[PDB]
Amino acid sequence: SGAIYVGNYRVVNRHLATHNDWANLVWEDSSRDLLVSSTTAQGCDTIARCDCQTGVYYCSSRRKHYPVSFSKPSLIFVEASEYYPARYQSHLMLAVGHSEPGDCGGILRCQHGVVGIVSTGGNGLVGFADVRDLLWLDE
Numbered sequence: 001s002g003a004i005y006v007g008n009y010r011v012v013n014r015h016l017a018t019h020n021d022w023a024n025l026v027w028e029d030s031s032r033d034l035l036v037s038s039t040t041a042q043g044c045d046t047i048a049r050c051d052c053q054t055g056v057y058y059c060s061s062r063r064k065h066y067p068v069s070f071s072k073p074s075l076i077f078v079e080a081s082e083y084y085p086a087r088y089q090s091h092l093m094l095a096v097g098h099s100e101p102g103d104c105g106g107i108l109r110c111q112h113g114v115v116g117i118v119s120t121g122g123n124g125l126v127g128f129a130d131v132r133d134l135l136w137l138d139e
């Protein structure tokens, strides 16, 4: 679990979104595993606007933050789950690191702010849904 709170927006993994998220829906994209909902309270997270490929992510299954080198956002095949059939997920970045399903939602941050959130993993890899191209999150 985990979310990004920026301005009047809440960013979560689409496969983990609540009834409240869907009733206050702003935008959702199955191919990216992202959903953004509106909030009443104001968010203070800073979204990074950069091409960084190094950062730090939070891994809930280990109660630790890990430094990672990650790939540029791209289409990556993702195995079928209870939430999606097998498909290409777009805007995904991989890194070598520990992840378990419950780790989705953990933030990845670089020096410039929030990069994205854990969305996939397994086999010693961790995949992150990029949020840096979503320029409208800021205003």
Ligand SMILES: NC(=O)[C@H]1CCCN(C(=O)Nc2ccccc2F)C1
Residues within 6 Å of the ligand: 015, 033, 078, 081, 083, 084, 089, 099, 100, 101, 102, 104, 119, 120, 121, 122
């Ligand atoms: N974005 C997706 O399609 C994910 C939906 C939930 C399930 N997905 C997934 O990768 N599970 C998983 C398994 C082992 C280690 C880490 C993991 F995140 C895929």
Ligand SMILES: [Zn+2]
Residues within 6 Å of the ligand: 048, 049, 050, 051, 052, 110, 111, 112, 113
């Ligand atoms: Zn950066």
